[PDB]
Design a protein around this ligand. Structure first.
Ligand code: WPS
Ligand code: WPS
Ligand code: WPS
Length: 164
């Protein structure tokens, strides 16, 4: 069902995360982690303290799809095991902030064609697929976007509910 999912999303905050390649999303899905530039790291740390759930919705550039969504389980931290991100020409591993732990809620894809009816008030009411890495998505838009994803029957939200 969708009842536990709605419970996790109640009063949540949502952020669009844009990866330049599939490899970084694969790493995030395998290891339960994400690292972003310091400008976004500061926004996510503030959001984590402010809301009962902070949801990252991932999209690989030029893929025409979202690749899933996850909930922050921690603020960012440094000094952990290294993560071999594949970075665009211009981004360096030192330039990345710390590492956030994340719990995946859905590892399934959603094509942009399916979210064409959702606009984001925090990005001039443009379609929700449009946004820079780190763009915040307003509550109602973000909730409806997450509810469009196919259910991921491999995930049990019971443990996520307990972290809240
Ligand atoms: C209203 C409201 N409160 N929490 C939500 N996920 C919503 C929506 N949509
Ligand atoms: C890794 C990572 N963190 N933030 C990004 N825009 C990427 C990529 N590609
Ligand atoms: C991997 C990894 N590097 N840093 C972390 N906090 C993790 C986790 N979990």
């Amino acid at each position: 069902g969708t009842s536990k999912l709605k419970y996790v999303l109640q009063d949540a905050r949502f952020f669009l995360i844009k990866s330049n390649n599939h490899e970084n999303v694969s790493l995030a899905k395998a290891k339960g982690v994400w690292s972003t530039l310091p400008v976004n790291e500061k926004k996510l740390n503030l959001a984590f303290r402010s809301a009962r759930s902070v949801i990252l919705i991932f999209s690989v550039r030029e893929s025409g799809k979202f690749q899933g969504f996850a909930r922050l389980s921690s603020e960012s931290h440094h000094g952990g095991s290294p993560i071999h991100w594949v970075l665009p020409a211009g981004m360096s591993a030192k330039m990345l902030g710390g590492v956030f732990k994340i719990d995946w809620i859905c590892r399934r894809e959603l094509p942009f064609t399916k979210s064409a009816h959702l606009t984001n008030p925090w990005n001039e009411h443009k379609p929700v697929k449009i946004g820079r890495d780190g763009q915040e998505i307003e509550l109602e838009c973000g909730t409806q976007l997450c509810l469009l994803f196919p259910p991921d029957e491999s995930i049990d939200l019971y443990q996520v509910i307990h972290k809240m």
